[PDB]
Each structure stands twice: as structure tokens, then as C-alpha cells.
Amino acid sequence: SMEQVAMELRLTELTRLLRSVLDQLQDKDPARIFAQPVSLKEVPDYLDHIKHPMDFATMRKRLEAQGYKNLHEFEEDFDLIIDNCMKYNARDTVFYRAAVRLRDQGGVVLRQARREVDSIG
């Protein structure tokens, strides 16, 4: 149907905007701490601690399959990155601190993304 096509065009355009959001958030992680999944070879107990691991590469795979239906879904995954790190790692660690800085800096990007998603519909 033509309606299904219009809907697919909307999803494609959301995907475009979320790709730009993802790039901007990932620039706030210049150490690349959140770039890849935590390695279960190197942190073998990880899944005993963290039930839903997340990282920027996993988000990018989902994004490119157009697997985010709305901004809320994408924000859920970004918050997992931050929240998982702040639980597994202690306050005095470079990992925790990286997460805090990512959360604070990403807030700005996400605030305007929400306006844009609502604005363009």
C-alpha cells in the first residue's frame, strides 16, 4: 500500500536523524570506553552482574536494520550503556567517570533530538 510506503519513509527519516544523534553521542566518548560490548572472555562474570549489556556498536547494528521505531527506544539503549557502567564500576574509576560525562553531555543532544522528532513528526 501507499500508506505502508509513507510509514516506511517516516522510519527511514527517523533512522537518518538517529544516525546523526548516535554520531554526536559517540563523540562524547573519545576514549572509546563504550564503543564495543564488554568482552565475556575478559570479564567472565559480567552477565551475573548486568542483565542487558549494551554498547554503541550493538546500537548501530539495530539502527541500520531500522530497528528503532521511535526516539524512546533509542534512548532506552543509550541509558543502558550508562546505567550498566555505573553499576558494574565503582565511583572512583575511569569507567564510571566516563559514563557520567557521557550522560551529562549526551543530555544536550537528546533534548534537541526530541524537539526535532516532534517538530518533523
Swiss-Prot record:
Subcellular location: Nucleus; Chromosome
Tissues showing expression: Highly expressed in testis.
Subunit structure: Component of some HBO1 complex composed of KAT7/HBO1, MEAF6, ING4 and BRD1/BRPF2. Component of the MOZ/MORF complex composed at least of ING5, KAT6A, KAT6B, MEAF6 and one of BRPF1, BRD1/BRPF2 and BRPF3. Interacts (via PHD-type zinc finger domain) with unmodified histone H3. Interacts (via PWWP domain) with dimethylated and trimethylated 'Lys-79' on histone H3.
Coiled-coil parts of chain: none
Designated name of the protein: Bromodomain-containing protein 1
Range of residues in the leader sequence: none
Lineage of producing organism: Eukaryota, Metazoa, Chordata, Craniata, Vertebrata
Bromo domain location: 9-113
Function: Scaffold subunit of various histone acetyltransferase (HAT) complexes, such as the MOZ/MORF and HBO1 complexes, that acts as a regulator of hematopoiesis. Plays a key role in HBO1 complex by directing KAT7/HBO1 specificity towards histone H3 'Lys-14' acetylation (H3K14ac), thereby promoting erythroid differentiation.
Shown residues within the full chain: 555 to 674 of 1058
Crosslink site: Glycyl lysine isopeptide (Lys-Gly) (interchain with G-Cter in SUMO2): 41
